[PDB]
């Protein structure tokens, strides 16, 4: 009855950030200290909760969102940030309660010749709202001339692919990210630390 964090953190495949994955966690016991100590993470940043307090708390639901971005973009996975990732792909709310966890995945997600499997949204008419997901792929009209289905200058396919090459600098290497959000509603709190 331990929470299935292994299925999230140790997943063989991770989503593209524009099509980010969400798993709901419920009705289970979670040791967050064990999680914290389970690997050499490069980011483990909590908001409104703390690593030292989580094992004494109960929540109605935990959501685990996961995806790949490049190293220099992990700083955008935080409340109050701007940039292509925060604005167009994955947005946290200002009042976020949870933890942002990341690790370098260059050994899995780069490839000689480039790994092109991971995508992000490069253009959007307006910013995302918090926890919004946009998987659309219609041509983006970047100027005032209508595109009429024809791509070219000022008429763009809206996604770009990372081109993860093993020799990239670390800021441009792939990082796997898990965002844990802790929700407390007027409902039974079924996700608890071992101290309960």
């Amino acid at each position: 009855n331990l929470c299935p964090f292994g299925e999230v953190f140790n997943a063989t495949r991770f989503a593209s950030v524009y099509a980010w994955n969400r798993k709901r966690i419920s009705n289970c016991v979670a040791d967050y200290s064990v999680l914290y100590n389970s690997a050499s993470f490069s980011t483990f940043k909590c908001y409104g909760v703390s690593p030292t307090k989580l094992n004494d708390l109960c929540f109605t639901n935990v959501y685990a969102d996961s995806f790949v971005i490049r190293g220099d973009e992990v700083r955008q996975i935080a409340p109050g940030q701007t940039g292509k990732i925060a604005d167009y792909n994955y947005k946290l709310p200002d009042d976020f309660t949870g933890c942002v966890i990341a690790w370098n995945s260059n050994n899995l997600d780069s490839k000689v010749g480039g790994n092109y499997n991971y995508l992000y949204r490069l253009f959007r008419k307006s910013n995302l709202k918090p926890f919004e997901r946009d998987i659309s792929t219609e041509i983006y009209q970047a100027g005032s001339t209508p595109c009429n289905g024809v791509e070219g200058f000022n008429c763009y396919f809206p996604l770009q692919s990372y081109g993860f090459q093993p020799t990239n600098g670390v800021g441009y290497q792939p990082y796997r990210v898990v965002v844990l959000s802790f929700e407390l509603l007027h409902a039974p709190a079924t996700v608890c630390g071992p101290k309960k």
Partner: nanobody
Amino acid sequence: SQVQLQESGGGLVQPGGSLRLSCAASGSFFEFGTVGWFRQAPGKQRELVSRITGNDHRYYADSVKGRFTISRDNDETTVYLQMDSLKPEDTAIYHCNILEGQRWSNYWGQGTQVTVSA
């Protein structure tokens, strides 16, 4: 940040013939997640002929749909444009390019010449 896009594969063929263009990228750093093949006929506007983003999001201009195929090399930062069933109006200098931020980059090299002549 430096990139060189080496364009090759053009030639002189008869109508109905085929060519494979190659856009081979090298350098310390470049964004190869989107690659576009452009062409400019004499005294005409440059147009995007075909684009590939990621592994499998492709675009073809109406006039080449069904005749051209864009693809990636499996082991190298190279993209190919297979041009089949060539027509005289495909005659142009073909250029490949990549994105820099939210726009096609300012790279505009020597390209490769395609001539289709009856």
